[PDB]
Amino acid sequence: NYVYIDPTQLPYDHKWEFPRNRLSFGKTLGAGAFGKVVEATAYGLIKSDAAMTVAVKMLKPSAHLTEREALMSELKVLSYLGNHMNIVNLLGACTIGGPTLVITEYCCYGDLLNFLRRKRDSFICSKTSPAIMEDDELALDLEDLLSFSYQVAKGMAFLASKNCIHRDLAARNILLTHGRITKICDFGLARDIKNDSNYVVKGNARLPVKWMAPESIFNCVYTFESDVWSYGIFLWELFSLGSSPYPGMPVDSKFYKMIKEGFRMLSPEHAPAEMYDIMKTCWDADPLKRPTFKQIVQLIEKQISE
Numbered sequence: 001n002y003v004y005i006d007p008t009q010l011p012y013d014h015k016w017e018f019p020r021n022r023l024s025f026g027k028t029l030g031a032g033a034f035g036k037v038v039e040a041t042a043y044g045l046i047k048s049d050a051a052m053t054v055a056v057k058m059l060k061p062s063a064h065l066t067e068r069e070a071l072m073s074e075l076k077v078l079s080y081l082g083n084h085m086n087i088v089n090l091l092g093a094c095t096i097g098g099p100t101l102v103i104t105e106y107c108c109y110g111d112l113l114n115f116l117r118r119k120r121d122s123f124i125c126s127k128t129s130p131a132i133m134e135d136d137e138l139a140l141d142l143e144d145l146l147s148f149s150y151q152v153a154k155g156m157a158f159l160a161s162k163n164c165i166h167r168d169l170a171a172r173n174i175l176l177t178h179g180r181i182t183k184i185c186d187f188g189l190a191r192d193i194k195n196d197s198n199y200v201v202k203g204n205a206r207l208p209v210k211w212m213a214p215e216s217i218f219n220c221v222y223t224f225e226s227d228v229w230s231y232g233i234f235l236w237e238l239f240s241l242g243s244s245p246y247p248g249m250p251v252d253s254k255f256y257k258m259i260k261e262g263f264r265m266l267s268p269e270h271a272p273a274e275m276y277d278i279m280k281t282c283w284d285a286d287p288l289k290r291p292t293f294k295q296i297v298q299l300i301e302k303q304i305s306e
């Protein structure tokens with residue numbers, strides 16, 4: 001019982017406008033064929049006597065009208081959503097006197113997938129041999145993984161409450177910032193998907209097939225519940241410390257058949273049983289039997305308090 005809004009029709013509130021001459025650009029954080037995101041310093045963005053680090057999304061010279069619309073749509077979507085602790089927050093925009101710039105908080109630890117991949121030595125396998133440890137104030141533990149699961153569920157519950165479907169939920173699209181706070185991000189204009197093997201050609205499009213619900217892959221259906229499927233795959237990435245899902249399996253005819261047949265990933269070693277149970281419910285072939293994000297938050301709350 002929903003229709004899709006054309007995001008180009010959403011309003012842009014001019015309260016966001018910031019002068020471009022108050023930005024100083026630094027290193028590139030991500031880039032695609034037509035766009036990029038740079039770290040920058042903004043002068044007097046929030047308080048007139050303070051400078052702060054921000055991220056800025058912009059187009060490259062190679063961009064056309066569709067990309068110009070795509071960037072303005074990102075601005076309009078964030079303006080619509082408003083702030084939440086667990087999504088990238090809009091801080092301002094430069095829409096006059098030069099190329100469109102969209103300014104958000106800068107997430108200082110980068111994407112969660114790469115972060116998990118460099119924290120693998122915080123964990124060990126279930127074995128019975130003696131182990132030696134080294135002190136490391138920046139280690140991760142199981143409580144951190146549970147916190148990341150909870151924070152991403154709250155961010156997704158927020159999006160669902162605003163009638164928003166993210167459509168590319170994955171550890172690579174979740175950022176980490178000060179306080180180990182996770183922020184769901186739109187990586188549009190910030191990745192060249194043609195060179196990311198996680199995006200597979202299926203017909204006309206390059207799609208993150210290992211993260212996608214069967215109704216999305218096979219029927220081009222996208223709902224709140226298809227995002228829940230992807231959240232289940234994200235949990236698997238989380239408790240597997242950044243393993244690629246379906247490890248060792250290419251996306252081919254066999255993969256598609258096995259998904260339809262009901263095959264699912266097995267529990268990661270470091271997943272609590274209750275967390276694997278959640279993943280399994282997120283992967284029900286019937287979208288109506290998957291939990292909602294509001295339900296997931298309620299469940300993870302129960303286990304975090306116990």
Ligand SMILES: CCn1c(=O)c(-c2cc(NC(=O)Nc3ccccc3)c(F)cc2Cl)cc2cnc(NC)cc21
Nearest residue numbers: 029030037055056057074088106107110184185186190
């Ligand atoms: C390169 C990836 N990246 C980004 O794309 C963005 C970013 C995201 C959106 N848009 C959104 O994130 N929108 C959105 C988020 C959640 C749900 C729906 C829309 C936007 F308009 C403008 C920017 Cl600059 C911020 C960012 C901050 N710090 C980073 N640290 C490495 C990386 C970052």
